[PDB]
A paper describes a structure:
The density map of the MD of AcrIF24, which is disordered in the crystallographic data, was clear enough for de novo atomic modeling. A Dali search with the MD did not return entries with Z scores of higher than 3.5, suggesting that this domain represents a novel fold. Interactions between AcrIF24 and the Csy complex mainly involve the NTD and MD of AcrIF24 and the Cas7.2-Cas7.6 f subunits of the Csy complex. AcrIF24MD mainly interacts with the Cas7.4f and Cas7.2f subunits of the Csy complex.
CRISPR-Cas systems are prokaryotic adaptive immune systems and phages use anti-CRISPR proteins (Acrs) to counteract these systems. In the type I-F system, after pre-crRNA is transcribed, Cas6f processes the pre-crRNA into small crRNAs, binds it, and further assembles with one Cas8f, one Cas5f, and six Cas7f proteins to generate the crRNA-guided surveillance complex (Csy complex). AcrIF24 targets the Cas7f subunits by engaging up to five Cas7f subunits (Cas7.2f-7.6 f), sterically blocks access to the crRNA guide by the complementary target DNA, and induces non-sequence-specific DNA binding to the Csy complex.
Numbering used by the authors:
A (entry chain Q), B (entry chain R): 6 to 338
C (entry chain V): 2 to 76
D (entry chain L): 3 to 223, 239 to 322
E (entry chain V): 153 to 228
F (entry chain K): 11 to 434
The structure:
Amino acid sequence: LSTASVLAFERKLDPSDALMSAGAWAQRDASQEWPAVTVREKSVRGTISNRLKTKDRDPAKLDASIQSPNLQTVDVANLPSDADTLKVRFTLRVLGGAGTPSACNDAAYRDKLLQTVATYVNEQGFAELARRYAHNLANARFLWRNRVGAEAVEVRINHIRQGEVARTWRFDALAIGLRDFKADAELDALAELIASGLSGSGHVLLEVVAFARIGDGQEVFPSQELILDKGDKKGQKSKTLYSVRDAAAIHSQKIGNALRTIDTWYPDEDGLGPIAVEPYGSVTSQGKAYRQPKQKLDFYTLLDNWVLRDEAPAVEQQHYVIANLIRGGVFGE
Amino acid sequence: LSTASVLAFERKLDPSDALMSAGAWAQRDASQEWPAVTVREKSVRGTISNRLKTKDRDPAKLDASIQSPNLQTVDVANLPSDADTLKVRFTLRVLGGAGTPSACNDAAYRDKLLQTVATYVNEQGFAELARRYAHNLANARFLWRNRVGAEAVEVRINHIRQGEVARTWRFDALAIGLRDFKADAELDALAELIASGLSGSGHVLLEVVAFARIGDGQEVFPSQELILDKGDKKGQKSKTLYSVRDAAAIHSQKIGNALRTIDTWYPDEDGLGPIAVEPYGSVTSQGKAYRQPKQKLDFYTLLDNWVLRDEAPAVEQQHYVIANLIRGGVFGE
Amino acid sequence: NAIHIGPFSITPAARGLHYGGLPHHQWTLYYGPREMAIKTLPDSYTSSEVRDEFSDIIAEFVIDARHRYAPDVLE
Amino acid sequence: VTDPEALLLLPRLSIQNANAISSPLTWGFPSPGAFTGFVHALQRRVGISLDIELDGVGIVCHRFEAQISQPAGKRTKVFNLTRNPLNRDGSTAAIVEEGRAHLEVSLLLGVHGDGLDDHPAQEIARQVQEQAGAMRLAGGSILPWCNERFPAPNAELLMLGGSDEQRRKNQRRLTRRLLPGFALVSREALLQQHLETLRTTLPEATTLDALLDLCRINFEPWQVRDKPGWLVPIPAGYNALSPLYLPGEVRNARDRETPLRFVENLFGLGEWLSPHRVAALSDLLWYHHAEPDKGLYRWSTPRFV
Amino acid sequence: THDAEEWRPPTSWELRHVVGEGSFTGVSGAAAAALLGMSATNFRKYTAGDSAANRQKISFAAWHYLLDRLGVKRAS
Amino acid sequence: QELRQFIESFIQERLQGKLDKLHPDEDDKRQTLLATHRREAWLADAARRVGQLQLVTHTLKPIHPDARGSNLHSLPQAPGQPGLAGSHELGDRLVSDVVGNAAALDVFKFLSLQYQGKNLLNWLTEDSAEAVQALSDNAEQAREWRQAFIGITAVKGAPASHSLAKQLYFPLPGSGYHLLAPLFPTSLVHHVHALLREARFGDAAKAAREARSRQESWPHGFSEYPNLAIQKFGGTKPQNISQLNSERYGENWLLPSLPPHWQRQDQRAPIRHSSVFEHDFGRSPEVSRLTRTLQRLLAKTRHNNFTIRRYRAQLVGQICDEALQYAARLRELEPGWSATPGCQLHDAEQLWLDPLRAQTDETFLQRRLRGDWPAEVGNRFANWLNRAVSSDSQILGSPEAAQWSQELSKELTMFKEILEDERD
């Protein structure tokens, strides 16, 4: 028995693109006609602040570069000067059936994988993973830089069963930390709902709204697009922000990456905090791979030991492997 | 007698390119002014996630490969943030005269083929194949990934004889499963209609409209385009979605592949579900061909045993080869 | 490996990226201190290909400088 | 060679997944041989059974939508393909490229037989519509009826019937339903004129059909040399590279009751022009004629200017 | 300028406007050396860029005569 | 006979090429096998892989992935139809492909290795009297070389179509049908591929593209081919059929045969603020380019005016036809013909771009909503044409200016007649 050549998992926990709007605090219960945050342009004169080559650290050349500074046009998004609260809204569906791949070659490999995931569900439920997903929904970690330095963050989560709201959760997202996973009654109810969605025992659709009290006219941080070339035929535009129709927005993969920031079992440390579950679990902001394949704790070696050679790892690493299965991906040769 | 050197069957059950639109649930009766789902672009940044070679474990090399960012431009398609229902519409025309090939070199072979298919219709009608086709129209199997995890799928079929509608069918596509084939009076009446269209006793035209209740702003899945690579050139957009006049669309052959998923008589198993009908019946997702020619159950040897050698196969295999006749093909040496 | 076309200089960005799976680098075209253009060109581009990627912007600069600083005409 | 007694208008035919390549040199609109084959197959299927003969096609192309893409670093274009099913060993297929497109075209068909004599015009037009709404035009399916409820019925218009001023007025009211598109004609005489005025420099013929239909940029005597209309390359027809063959002597023929030949493609110049620029609506009819003593299997539109 | 009290010699970047295969005159360094009656190496000494790497500045008469011979300034 | 003196040197060069990868154990046997057909015994190599793989100037390969048939290379002339082009006169180096699966391209190289300046490569296929000295040996090697050369370019004779060979019916004059199997014109597409590579690339085209990038002069123009599509052959191994080289890796590029309007499925020109008031703003790139090209023609010829005036009249008629087509395209995308802000030209633009009869423009609006107002639309079109084509004061001093004025008046009269006939 060997691993399959092609094997692909569709993602559970599908989020939508998060849209931004603005308003006043204590009007957030009437926050349905809040106007969208618009992306504008402004001019930026760039100073000289890079490291010099020290083959160009001559003072005359430095003053000649400082005398002629360069200029760009930059997309920017701010709150209005009379509004102090950013509202960020998206929808998230929890589907279930996380073990079954959407593509396979070997029938024996997918049968062995299916009974391995079935035994994982039979030993314990999705309660740990859904508890950590409900935690990452409870604190507004999906507000990436909009959460930083906020005065007060409040998350409203609505389980939407028919076309109307079935249940309502209210979380103080700064009380729920970004570090440790506490225990709370409403949070455990939300975790049980997400676990019932992940086990295929229901169809879960949630509307998540987050209110961050940032300040009047302050800069918000939508998702940022990609610029390949730049010239004088444009406005020398060097920064482009993402936008659905006419609204500052966050990419759905950004919300998804902040959702699965649950991995606290990486072998390097645990005092840093959770990272996102990835094969060779890596942080782009740190440029480093936790769970190196030299150690026996990346996703591929753990999965091949669990399925092929029946070496079931520790229950923390079992949570990690099943979280990687929930994340989805292309796994194979 | 021998098989003809040329043999060419025109396809019946011609579908249209299924166009997507969006709206709210309980407005689906007035879903004629629903705006189209458009295709946008966005930017993705990912990490190293695939399997590494054993010579490339090398943690310094992995950290070096992480620190080079991986960016793509991706075509995406979403619902609007105030619409939760995807409406997919296509037209399907049934022609009849399924026995006659569009080309045959041998006249005696085509006369034996015509009397063989005439005796096949004389023994029993198209009602098994027509009932399975009405099943694949009843459950929304043409919603390929748009049906996965949907809340409520509902299919409307309009038989249009003259310039107005002749008859309507209303189906709950989630009640009718994708595994087994039921019997229902509306479904059997629709089966009688597709059977009478297949028998040359008329020309049937249907308009099929499926409403899936996905969620606000969620991602839909139209067809993907084929771009052969410009290898020694710049990096390309690594996803392209099919669109007809700025409307997200599924290919005609994708709906046609979804319609003929009727084959439950392949010798490998019967619990995995129906597959599409083709000679050497092979599904691209599994990467493996059922109805191998080393067994005498593929289409070609069954056709040669029925026509040339007068060995009439079993009635489910007669259904299989007749469904391959409706599907069409270019058969020959 | 900068490229010098008269008073113009095209320099790479000292660390590449991966666009579409392929490795790329940002090339900046300067006219002295004035930054004229930036493009994202892949690796395995020869210096000739980098040259006539920016030849059109150089030609537009030449047309504009030839029309702007044209001498006077007496009739 | 035959002036039609009346004209039928296939009003707005929508076509999906039609062939775009249609030739080893061009890729745009399909060849007019497909439209002549369509009207001959329509004559076979419903034309014979009504004491009607059909002769030629006028085509106007209301809209075009090619399934192509530009590969992001080049000014050329590539074709969009489809995923064929796997082979018998389940490995992969052999990628053979095909070019699909979407068309909106009208058809102008001439009739000579007992048109208004045995049957009225409306029932003839309606059953030709019902017949043509069950087949395919150029490799792609005739897209059936959608929420275009307006443009359904045809107009069997008598060509020479009525007063001559009334003839111009009814052909103008028929051209009123064909203004969105631009008709297609053959331009063999303009090809020959440019060929003779080019042959003062060099005696070559395919270099002309190259140089007729590009953007010729002549230097400072920076200008662009231009033709007054829309000059396109078209497949001019079929020229046999082999003699006549009997039905039985060639293996793997389509029919052992029809004589065969090996042929090559003749390429020529066509023209897209506004339909108001031609005063007689019977000028646009594309006839195919055979000269089987030699290889000339030609489609054109004679009696056009 | 023609006034030698206010004239300063061109830098290497200003010299590359007129001399070089990418320059606006399209005149190489060998042809510009042959216009001034020099060798290619002594003229390439002008086109180094920094005063340390064996670079001297062009003279008033040679610069104005070169602008005369390239057809840039009339320099009567 | 060159095989005794110069073909010995050619076989020695081939032996040095085959012995460049020469080793002691296997490469020694490879050098021995090369020297067995290196001095005068090349007829053994021609018996091996010289006549077993032959092809014609039009291979039946690209008609399918694998279609059994004989790619005949006949038909050197067919100038019957004097309105078409193709293989009627190839003439200038009609190349041929090695149709088949023979990897022994050394025979195809040796067919031209002694072909230039020697009668061995040209007479080896037939009339091998120079092949008597071309063998450089006795009658056995010369007979083997002549047999291989005859078997190289030998026709298949017995015809074979396929299912994957595009068999087509063509109707006869008042009788039955004929079956037709087109071959892929490999020599013709290679000739036009060489012509398109000479047009698109090459140093003369590069120099002319530089001399048009700036506005300087060069005593010849150049060529640009927009919308060239690419078609690939076979796949990752583009040598299942020959004449498909390394750079020509199945590369068959096709010239455009497009209708005039390729895009803009959405209504690009609505009755907007900046356009509903000024209906003659000309929201179109092709119409604007045609107007700029018509306005650029302003000089007068002493003997070219007799055709230049007719060309300008044809250009003005094409501009009027494009205006009528733009009116039709606007009329195709007007479900609700409703007036909005900035539509102040709605007396003329809303009348000439009038949709189907609404409730507000009823029979009671038979002069307001249902009014046939082609005179004001013709006046606005004539004003837009006079702004685009401002005639000189002495432009009518020759007959070209009076002819242009008469052509503009006749085109405005034809547009007014089409608008009045279409005005209800």
